[PDB]
Structures are given as structure tokens and as C-alpha cells.
């Protein structure tokens, strides 16, 4: 039968409620913040988080101010999603606090996607540094590439002419920043909120090159919410 469709992948990512995260660097990127109810809410949520004493306790302290992190195995991405979805006593507006930012948020979605068995047989997963600025890549993004694809490896850059047909972009930070799923969660580049800063990019992880992938269990994650009927 048919493989898993973009719509079902997007629905799986919607279950994570990425718009509800505390986006710890929201104040650094006003130009990336959508004027939507979600964007307004995210701005206010960060205000409440930032000066709450619990934001300066682990792991919140570390989630809000990350050291360079470059996961190189599928299981690390799955664990990243699992750890960020743990609910602790720290709540804002009655909602358990989860925290991420422009660099590492994409790792959560890489874990969600790597944990799905029907994604495994239809797409390879990659994680790229994007939003290039003065030799730095400010923003990591997750990609779904059709099976068979090999993206350039550093120091070669990823550009449009080596971006495979059928690639889907996954950017949970964009959703934290108020953009809708249709601009961020498993969509083509023409639909992507930050499509003028997508290229050039650097490819930091390719599941197609990860020898540990096959022994990485699927179904490890519980979706953060269940889709409403």
C-alpha cells in the first residue's frame, strides 16, 4: 500500500504542541516572530519563564543557554525529545514548562521522526545548520529526504541545486515562534517560514550514514498529546 503521507507526518509533529514551548531566545529574533496568537502567547510565556526562580535550576538553565551540541546518532535525537517532554513541577499558565531555542529545537523533531517506523522506510532524516551569518549557522533544521538521497558533507555546503526533490523541512522553533504547521512541520521549501535563509546550510547529521540506525528501536516515544477526534 501507500507509504506514510506528509499530512500524517505533520499531524504527528502537531501532537508535540511545539507552539507551547518556552522559546528561550525569542527576544533575540523579533524578525522571526510571527504576529499570530501563538507568537504573542510565546512572547508572554517567555517573559513569565525568564524571571521565575525555577528557570535558573537544572535542566532549565542548560536548555535555555545551550553549549554546542552535535548529536551523531539516532538514539541521541530520540532521547532529546524524551527528555524535553518530561513534565516537572515547573508550570506557566497551568502548563508544564518545556524549553528550547534556535539551535537545538530541531533535534526534538529529529527524534520524533526517527522514532516512527513508517518514516524509517520512506525517508532518511538529516539535521542541518542553517540561517548562515558570518561563518556561523544560527538555526538548526530537520529534513526528511526521500530514500536514496545523500546530502553534501562538510565542508561542502547544502544549496538549492543539491537539495533533493521531495525534501520536507521540519522546524519546531518556527512553530514556537508563532508560525503555523503549514509553514514549518513537514513542508516543502516553498511553504517554509524562513525559506530565504534556508541556504546555504551545513549537514551535521544524516541517518543514512549512521551505522546505529538499524538497531535503534522505534516507538520509544509517547506523543505529547493525542490528536483530538
Numbering used by the authors: 0 to 228
Which text from the study accompanies this structure?
Among all bacterial pathogens, Legionella pneumophila maintains the largest known set of translocated substrates, delivering over 300 proteins to the host cell via its Type IVB, Icm/Dot translocation system. In at least nine instances, this regulation is direct—a hallmark of an emerging class of proteins called metaeffectors, or “effectors of effectors”. Through detailed structural and functional analysis, we show that metaeffector activity derives from a diverse range of mechanisms, shapes evolution, and can be used to reveal important aspects of each cognate effector's function. After release into the host cell, translocated bacterial substrates (effectors) regulate one another through several different functional interactions: indirectly, through counteracting modification of a shared host target, or directly through either steric complex formation or direct modification of one effector by another.
To define the mechanism of LegL1 inhibition of RavJ, we first solved the crystal structure of the N‐ and C‐terminal portions of RavJ spanning amino acid residues 1–228 and 251–371, respectively. Structures for amino acid residues 1–228 and 251–371 of RavJ were solved separately to a resolution of 1.3 and 1.9 Å, respectively. Despite no identifiable sequence similarity, the overall fold of the N‐terminal domain of RavJ resembled that of papain‐like cysteine protease family members. Comparison of RavJ with its top structural homolog, human tissue transglutaminase (TGM2), identified three conserved residues (C101, H138, D170) along with another adjacent residue (W172) as a putative catalytic site. The N‐terminal structure contains a structurally conserved putative catalytic triad (C101/H138/D170). To determine which of these structural elements are essential for effector function, we tested the effect of their ablation on yeast growth. Strikingly, single substitutions in each of the four N‐terminal catalytic site residues, as well as the C‐terminal loop mutant, abrogated the yeast growth inhibition of RavJ. While expression of full‐length RavJ showed a severe growth defect in a spot dilution assay, mutation of each of the putative catalytic residues or the adjacent W172 to alanine fully relieved toxicity as did substitutions in the conserved C‐terminal motif.
